[PDB]
Amino acid sequence: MAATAAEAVASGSGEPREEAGALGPAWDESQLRSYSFPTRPIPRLSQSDPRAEELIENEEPVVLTDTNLVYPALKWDLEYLQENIGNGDFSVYSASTHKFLYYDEKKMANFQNFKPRSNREEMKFHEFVEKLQDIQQRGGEERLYLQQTLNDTVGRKIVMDFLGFNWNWINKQQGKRGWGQLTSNLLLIGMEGNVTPAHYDEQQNFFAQIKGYKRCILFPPDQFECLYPYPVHHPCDRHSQVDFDNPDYERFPNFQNVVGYETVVGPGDVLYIPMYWWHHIESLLNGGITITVNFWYKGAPTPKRIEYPLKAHQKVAIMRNIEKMLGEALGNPQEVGPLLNTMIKGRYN
Amino acid sequence: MAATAAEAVASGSGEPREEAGALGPAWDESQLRSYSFPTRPIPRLSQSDPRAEELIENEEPVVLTDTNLVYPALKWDLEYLQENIGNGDFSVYSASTHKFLYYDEKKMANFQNFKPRSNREEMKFHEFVEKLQDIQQRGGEERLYLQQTLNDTVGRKIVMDFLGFNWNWINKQQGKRGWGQLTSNLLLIGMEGNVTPAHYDEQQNFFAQIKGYKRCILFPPDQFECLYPYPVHHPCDRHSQVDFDNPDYERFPNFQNVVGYETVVGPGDVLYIPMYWWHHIESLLNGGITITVNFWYKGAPTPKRIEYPLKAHQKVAIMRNIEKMLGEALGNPQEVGPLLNTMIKGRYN
């Protein structure tokens, strides 16, 4: 049966990997949160595998197991980083829920009724570790997620580690795919159980896992219809409105049709998250703290000649632009919706 | 009661006018078709009345009773026109229904499932009169509507009549309102009972009644929501989808909120139909043939500085442009609807 064969292919991140030296199962199923939708495995490949090159070229996710991208950073923990990462400020988000929904603070002026479920506090790295240690022994419920672009202020040893990254491999990827510049490296340090809810980014991403394990659930650009992003002028622009823990099928009926691609990344793994791909990222339950460094690249420019039919990501680009232009032309972002509704009701729906 | 006072103001075209020399009621109520919505009178004013100038300036409909705009054309009938209008071709529409819905023949390639309820035949003027006489004595059901832009081929007497139009008055209106050029004069010769269903035009219109009586029902640009025009790429672009004789309230719920401005124009009356105003025009039942000449002017250009909030007609302009741009960008007009729906569903509605 195609139905039974479908349930076989819906195998998620699959059989948990065995760590070298018989050091036991890396992780187990009970560490994964439970969701309402099926998932297919993201290919886990060698960088020298021609299939991997083909997937990156076609802008499809692949986990590369042996890039050595952040090889020198594999020795990073809280102690090493507190000693070496400098006296700069670090953005630390704090929430009472496990979900850390990103919000654009520049867009909060348009949406005054929006109240953020997380707070951003700028602190020193030793303060983050102190606040982390504080919650751990107090048995508190507060969750933290350090999310900071790595800058000038990092110390000499972090700079040295940075130099030891596999720039050869990634410079060639940037070159071959026609991408623009590297815009940032985001350091992510999360607590066990922390969730970054489904969203897409407008940049190409090499997601380099350093410490702990992250389950990454991805959705293709053509599933825009199933994922219901906030309006473009909303602070949560690019993020799904659907609560994955309790999906509102009345408001979001096509979420019943959503199908993910998932994997669990650990130390040394690099996940290619293609531009415009939805991703939901969770630090495994009871897995300890996680560390990731991403590499964000501006996408390749719009091709000289347009080909038809359009790709899913091009239609997303289009919809975004329609929303922006309408916001500007109407002089008020709040007016976009009423105009769009007026445009389709009894005309296109 | 405001409800009773509302039913008083909803007086339609009002008390039928008395023709000079006690020649009886110009028309009576039984000649008007019955519709589901209320209507308010369009002001019927002298051209020298300051209110009339104010209404045209504010782009609101007004009937001017004494312009003398087409004074020399008041002697026009079928015999006089057949004798003088030339050997040129005339577009004659033919229908089995009373409704003459305009269709863009250039847009019919996008919409192959669209079948026109009327047919265009090019003929000579004597052929139109012959075909008209043919149906009249045969007791047929076929309806004709001559609709032809007046051109080079008109004879000397029609040219002479044209010269005697009140160009002074209308040139000053064109000048004062900042309008563009006169683009055409449409001759309309319809049979009693003929209906032009609700639509708007993208030009300013002075609608000069010559023979017989027409009931004109107008709706302001802000009633776009109640009138449900076809998609912009549809042959019936700018026309209401609502069948006024049998309105589909399931498909078109806000048609229950529609409120018109109506008048009956006769020989010598000029109705200003402002650009973007919906108009439904019907030749009175058992009123004989009707003759009208319109004057179509390109609207005044987009002002240098934009003012907020936007006017209703500007939002209409905007919606039209969004539909056009999407048609072009997607490479296929049929794709506009699916993209628009995807954009709003569970996001803006």
């Binding site: 603070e105 672009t149 970054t196 969203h199 996408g299 719009t302 289009i318 975004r320 632009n321 | 072009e328």
Partner: peptide, 18 residues
Amino acid sequence: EVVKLLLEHGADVDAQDK
């Protein structure tokens, strides 16, 4: 070049005032 205007993209990512 309306098509090109509609196909253009920004560089927005989850990082504050970037």
